[PDB]
Amino acid sequence: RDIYRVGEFKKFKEDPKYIAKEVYQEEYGRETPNYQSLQPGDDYTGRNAWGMTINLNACIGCNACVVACQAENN
Amino acid sequence: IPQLGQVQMLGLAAAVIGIGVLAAGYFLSPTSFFESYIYGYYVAMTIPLGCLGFLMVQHLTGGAWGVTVRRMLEAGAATLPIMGLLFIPIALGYFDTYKALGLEHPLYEWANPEVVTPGGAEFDPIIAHKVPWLSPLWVTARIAIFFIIWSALALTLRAWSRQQDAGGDAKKLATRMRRLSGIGVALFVITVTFFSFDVAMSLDPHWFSTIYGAHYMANAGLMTLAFLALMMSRVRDAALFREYVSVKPIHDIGKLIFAFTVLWTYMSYGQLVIIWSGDVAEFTPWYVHRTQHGWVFVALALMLFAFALPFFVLLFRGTKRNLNTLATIAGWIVVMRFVDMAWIILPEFREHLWDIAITDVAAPIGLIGLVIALFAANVQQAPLLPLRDPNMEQLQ
Amino acid sequence: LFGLIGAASGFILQYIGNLVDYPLNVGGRPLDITNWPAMIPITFESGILLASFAAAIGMI
Amino acid sequence: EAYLLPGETYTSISAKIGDVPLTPPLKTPKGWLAGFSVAFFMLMIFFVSVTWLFIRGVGIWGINIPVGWGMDIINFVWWIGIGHAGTLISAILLLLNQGWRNSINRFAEAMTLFAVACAGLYPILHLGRPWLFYWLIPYPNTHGMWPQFRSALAWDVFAISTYATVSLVFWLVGLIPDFATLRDRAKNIWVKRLYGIAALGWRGSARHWHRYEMASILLAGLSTPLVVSVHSIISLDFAISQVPGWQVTVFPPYFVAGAVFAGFAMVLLLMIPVRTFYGFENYITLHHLDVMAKVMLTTGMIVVYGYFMEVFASLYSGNEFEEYLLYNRLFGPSSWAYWGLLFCNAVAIQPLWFKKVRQNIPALLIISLIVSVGMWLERYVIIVISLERDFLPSSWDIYIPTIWDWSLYIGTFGLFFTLLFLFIRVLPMINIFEMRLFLYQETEKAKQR
Ligand code: SF4
């Protein structure tokens, strides 16, 4: 499944989007998944939108975030 | 009988007009001809299939409404073999006959060699995953097997009903038809479900619905019930109804039309809410196209003209007891059923409400005219209301 | 009479409660009339209840 | 065959059905005492299970993080499906003008009320904070909070409440004439005035039967879409979700057919001993069992059609999750329930096609038992197996039920049978005025030959 994505740096330099173009070709035959929804959702234009990004190239599994979450959130 | 001949002449005139303008649209554009012929074949198939199913259902559960229209159901179901020959053009579309007859690209996506073959220019892995099942040879074999089953069941039941008018109606020719209908119901459900999967659902190989097909059976049942109510109002004075038919069968058929209308609305809403609340992207493109470029107005009209208005009118004890009023409602229902099928099939081709061509209106009328003409010939072949029948006492 | 009141009452209750009084956004589902799916069941059940109660109590 | 065999009289029906109740307490048959003792013992098992569940919590079950819904939902769907057949017999057959509903509508509807009463505890028991169940009901509060109404559990609350109330008032409307016949034969003065206020002083007369028949016709015409929508909503609770094995579009009719399937199996299993014990062989004939097994076979075939549609859907789509769902059902760690499903509700229902098997009583009892086991296995396959293995492989685990949810199951059986034994002891189990009307109709039909 498409849980974990891995690439090479030599191919990443020429195109940083090459990993995403793969998989979608083997799953759909095209380079872009034209996902369509039936729900409108909300706008979030002029307001704050909190988000988080996890870099897999930096995670080492030290399990420090788990103990911090346990100590912070009771 | 004279009213049946007038109906036969009207059906012949509607059929020849529809075929003529359909041929004109073919000469103008060969692709749009087959696109409309698919929808016309899908909408015209509802009368014979629904007639066969209701014939076998009323044989399993005998009632007054079943004996009232038994011969009419047999006449409508006896037109199935001619419908199988009418499938030949569609089969020619998805076979190698394309590149001829004016078809640039094959009629179905799963029949295009550029799609189902790996390494092709238009390779789609989801469509190609079904390459042995969705094949022109396999589809034609499944369609032919379903037609052999349907024709064998209909012709055998009609032949046994004709023999019932000779002798031995109590001991045999009433239990044999009941057991044949018992096994036929399961056979008819499986065959029609896969027929609906092959002809209509395979137009978009990216989408599938399990409830689909059963929606087609309820749709065909509502169409053939309104058709039976119309033809009953036409032949209400054939000297056979006058002496053996009262208001009870008309009231029961009106109640059946009401029950099948709310059943169809229940199936359609069930499919809608299941796909709507669970916003999975593999099932959303279907309801996206049907709510885009004006197609939403078609859905809203079906919600009101095909549900609320029939539900409230047929709610009363009147309008179902009176044959005249029931026939008027049945005509509105029949018109709405045509629009519902257009909402399911036409968006795949036209993709716009304005893009609907004249052939999309020609093919349904052109093929239903042949269906009505064959139905009128089959009902004039034999007398109505089998007098030699142990269930005839239910009419007293 | 009571059945139509029951159906109308159920639709009004849902629309006022979740699309007017407290407009909670749940799963991006619409807050307009476009939330007409998922309002049919409560409306249908309310109408059947009032109609059935009227028939039994009315006969008595 | 005929649905009413001998030359019964109106007084024959009245005395034979009225003699089962009104029996002095010291003259109660010993078989009723043994059955009520077993049902009361299982009821004490129910009380111990619920008490411990309230004291400790829903953690005594085997539910975990991936499988958050265990047998606490399986037994709920099983019980709520048991009553669909009785609601069909007591309402749908009234509109269909079928004459074989006159002798079994009372017992069947009683089974519906008791099955709904048993199924109405799981939405409260499985809550984990049960005493806050009223928060799902739109009530005036000091906060200003509403239920979502966009979830299927809010529909479920409105559906069960409407189903239970309408089935209760319809049952009482049908019991009113029988209450009048009981207070007319009650002999004792204090047994009277009890059925008297229950009959509301019926005084069976014209200008009253007309409104009674029309209200009963309207009630049946209203309760038919009610029970259909109820089980369709119990199907929507899984179909609304995104779980691969749960988002199946054919779930509403598949659940309705499965409910009436298991219901007819339970009704046959419980009516055959009732028929053979009391002198009711003249009212519940063999043609009753024949047509009931035919309806059960038809609903089982619709269920098999649902099995095929699920298999076709898993094979038709190129989704990894539908394919793994089929693989986890066929060769997974819980494939035993799928194999038991295929054996019970698909192979064992085939002998019902023939006539000799359809007229055999022990074969009907065995088939009904196998069908009930297969229905429980089907609810297990739909819920637990689909919930065990989801999209993220790391969130995979196994569900192993404990002893307490089993104790709740046997306990619910005991409460169900306790209520049934009390019903057959106090009230008449066969609708009397409908049976004598059926006798009058058969006499008129024989007059017209
Ligand atoms: S704290 Fe450790 S385990 Fe958590 S994200 Fe950072 S590197 Fe990974």
PDB file of N, CA and C and ligand atoms in Angstrom, chain A residues 54 58-66, ligand 1:
ATOM      1  N   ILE A  54       5.591  16.099   8.938  1.00  0.00           N
ATOM      2  CA  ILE A  54       6.529  15.121   9.480  1.00  0.00           C
ATOM      3  C   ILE A  54       7.501  14.735   8.375  1.00  0.00           C
ATOM      4  N   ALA A  58      14.171  12.631   8.632  1.00  0.00           N
ATOM      5  CA  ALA A  58      14.739  13.011   9.916  1.00  0.00           C
ATOM      6  C   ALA A  58      14.283  12.140  11.076  1.00  0.00           C
ATOM      7  N   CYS A  59      13.220  11.359  10.907  1.00  0.00           N
ATOM      8  CA  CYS A  59      12.737  10.530  12.001  1.00  0.00           C
ATOM      9  C   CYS A  59      13.660   9.336  12.206  1.00  0.00           C
ATOM     10  N   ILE A  60      14.048   9.105  13.460  1.00  0.00           N
ATOM     11  CA  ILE A  60      14.933   8.008  13.828  1.00  0.00           C
ATOM     12  C   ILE A  60      14.300   7.057  14.829  1.00  0.00           C
ATOM     13  N   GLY A  61      13.058   7.300  15.240  1.00  0.00           N
ATOM     14  CA  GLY A  61      12.385   6.399  16.157  1.00  0.00           C
ATOM     15  C   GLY A  61      12.853   6.484  17.592  1.00  0.00           C
ATOM     16  N   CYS A  62      13.339   7.649  18.025  1.00  0.00           N
ATOM     17  CA  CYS A  62      13.822   7.801  19.392  1.00  0.00           C
ATOM     18  C   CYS A  62      12.703   7.764  20.425  1.00  0.00           C
ATOM     19  N   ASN A  63      11.441   7.839  19.993  1.00  0.00           N
ATOM     20  CA  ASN A  63      10.279   7.751  20.879  1.00  0.00           C
ATOM     21  C   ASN A  63      10.264   8.866  21.921  1.00  0.00           C
ATOM     22  N   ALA A  64      10.880  10.006  21.602  1.00  0.00           N
ATOM     23  CA  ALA A  64      10.830  11.149  22.506  1.00  0.00           C
ATOM     24  C   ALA A  64       9.511  11.900  22.392  1.00  0.00           C
ATOM     25  N   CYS A  65       8.899  11.899  21.205  1.00  0.00           N
ATOM     26  CA  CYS A  65       7.622  12.581  21.026  1.00  0.00           C
ATOM     27  C   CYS A  65       6.496  11.879  21.775  1.00  0.00           C
ATOM     28  N   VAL A  66       6.590  10.558  21.945  1.00  0.00           N
ATOM     29  CA  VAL A  66       5.543   9.824  22.649  1.00  0.00           C
ATOM     30  C   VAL A  66       5.563  10.152  24.135  1.00  0.00           C
TER      31      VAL A  66
HETATM   32  S1  SF4 E   1      10.921  12.478  18.347  1.00  0.00           S
HETATM   33 FE1  SF4 E   1      12.017  10.672  17.491  1.00  0.00          FE
HETATM   34  S2  SF4 E   1      10.347   9.217  16.943  1.00  0.00           S
HETATM   35 FE2  SF4 E   1       9.355  11.250  17.244  1.00  0.00          FE
HETATM   36  S3  SF4 E   1       9.309  12.157  15.148  1.00  0.00           S
HETATM   37 FE3  SF4 E   1      11.230  12.903  16.130  1.00  0.00          FE
HETATM   38  S4  SF4 E   1      12.807  11.392  15.479  1.00  0.00           S
HETATM   39 FE4  SF4 E   1      10.789  10.421  15.056  1.00  0.00          FE
END
